[PDB]
């Protein structure tokens, strides 16, 4: 299973971006997937998760500025970041929910996002 990320950039604060994770395979249809992110020096954490039922779950800071979604066909997941705050700097990846969990998890690139002043 391979995870390729996309979208990041350097936007103002109250910006917008779109991240994309493409999947191999049918992970994206049969398993529930998150949105991490790492700012530098810091633990990284879950921001948003996508389960097979396509409910969604949020961390209290984002929620209502950033939509996770996915498209089975094109075995994408998305994170759309709108309203974006200097907080949400950081590093972005995608994987599997209960990677993090689990030992020895393999991430992917990422996707860099700044928002600056």
């Known amino acids: 299973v391979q995870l390729v990320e996309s979208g990041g950039g350097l936007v103002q604060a109250g910006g917008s971006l779109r991240l994309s994770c493409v999947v191999s395979?049918?992970?994206?249809?049969?398993?529930?997937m998150g949105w991490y992110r790492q700012a530098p020096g810091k633990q990284r954490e879950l921001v948003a998760a996508?389960?097979?039922?396509?409910?969604?779950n949020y961390v209290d800071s984002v929620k209502g500025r950033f939509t996770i979604s996915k498209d089975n066909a094109k075995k994408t997941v998305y994170l759309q970041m709108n309203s974006l705050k200097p907080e949400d700097t950081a590093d972005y990846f995608c994987?599997?929910?209960?990677?993090?969990?689990?030992?020895?998890?393999?991430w992917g690139q990422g996707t860099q996002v700044t928002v600056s002043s």
């Open positions: 996508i389960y097979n039922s396509g409910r969604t």
């Open positions: 395979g049918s992970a994206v249809s049969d398993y529930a």
């Open positions: 994987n599997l929910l209960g990677a993090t969990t689990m030992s020895n998890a393999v």
